[PDB]
Amino acid sequence: GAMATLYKKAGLLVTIPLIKGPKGFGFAIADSPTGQKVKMILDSQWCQGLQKGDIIKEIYHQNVQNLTHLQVVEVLKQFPVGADVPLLILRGGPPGQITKV
Hints:
It is a single chain. The chain has helices at about 1-10, 70-80, and strands spanning about 10-20, 25-30, 35-40, 55-60, 60-65, 85-90, 100. By secondary structure, the chain is of the alpha+beta class. The strands form two sheets. Strands 1-6-4-5 form a four-stranded antiparallel beta sheet. The protein has a three-stranded antiparallel beta sheet with strand order 3-2-7. The longest helix has 10 residues, at about 70-80. The N and C termini lie far apart (about 35 Å). It is found in: Cell membrane; Cell junction, Tight junction; Nucleus.
């Protein structure tokens, strides 16, 4: 309703509690005009709550907005299987390589 709609207009910062699965965190990111954007959810069990279109702002409380696509991929890849990694994303609000992570 009204609240959900207004939160989409305003934007919402959401912390997603990632757990690294055997084949990664269960999603793919696109190097988009507006940052590292979630392109696909591949296995939601490892990234509960994460949605297509979410934009990565922090990894493990570190701001990653100055990192490149390849650097963000590299940092996510570095975590060992089973690792808990808080992921802060921006969802909605005032508005090409794709890599599995």
